[PDB]
Amino acid sequence: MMYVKLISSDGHEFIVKREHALTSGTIKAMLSTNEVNFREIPSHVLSKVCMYFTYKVRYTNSSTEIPEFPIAPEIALELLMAANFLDC
């Protein structure tokens, strides 16, 4: 269907558009019952990953003047680790 579920290590369930989640080659491989469990990605990180999907779809080619994607210093290392695993 139109949406997929991404579950964080702490059990938060993130429901996102399939097309948004398929932007990650890792998630695409993990999907192929429309649900993926991330045993190592906590909610304060996975919520940011979902916000990145929305940002990327909205600002890719183009409409001009792209804002900066914000990342709080406290989440930066774990988000880097997740972006590296997800190929984001």
């Binding site: 429901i15 948004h20 999907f53 600002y59 406290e74």
Partner: protein, 103 residues
């Protein structure tokens, strides 16, 4: 004008977008298609404020410049069990302390 939202209930977070001109009821129809609960079994909130069905998202304070793709606005959600449960949103996990090397 598109608005970007997080519809949150307990440990569930729906990432979706809607028009600023769209209604609270139309957002319940979106929730219904995902969570399989009709609009009459739903209550939508802006912080602690119960949102009225016929009001637009824009009138409810969800604007294109505040409900951003990279920083979406939160809409609270509560279901009817028949009585409605109290609004409850589980916080996301707390980030660890900044490493010495990062501070």
């Amino acid at each position: 004008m598109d608005v970007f939202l997080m519809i949150r209930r307990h440990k569930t977070t729906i990432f979706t977008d809607a028009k600023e001109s769209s209604t609270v009821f139309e957002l319940k129809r979106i929730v219904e298609g995902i969570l399989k609960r009709p609009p009459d079994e739903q209550r939508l909130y802006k912080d602690d404020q119960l949102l009225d069905d016929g009001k637009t998202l824009g009138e409810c304070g969800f604007t294109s410049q505040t409900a951003r793709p990279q920083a979406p606005a939160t809409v609270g959600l509560a279901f009817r069990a028949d009585t409605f449960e109290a609004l409850c949103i589980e916080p996301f996990s707390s980030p660890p302390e900044l490493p010495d090397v990062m501070k």
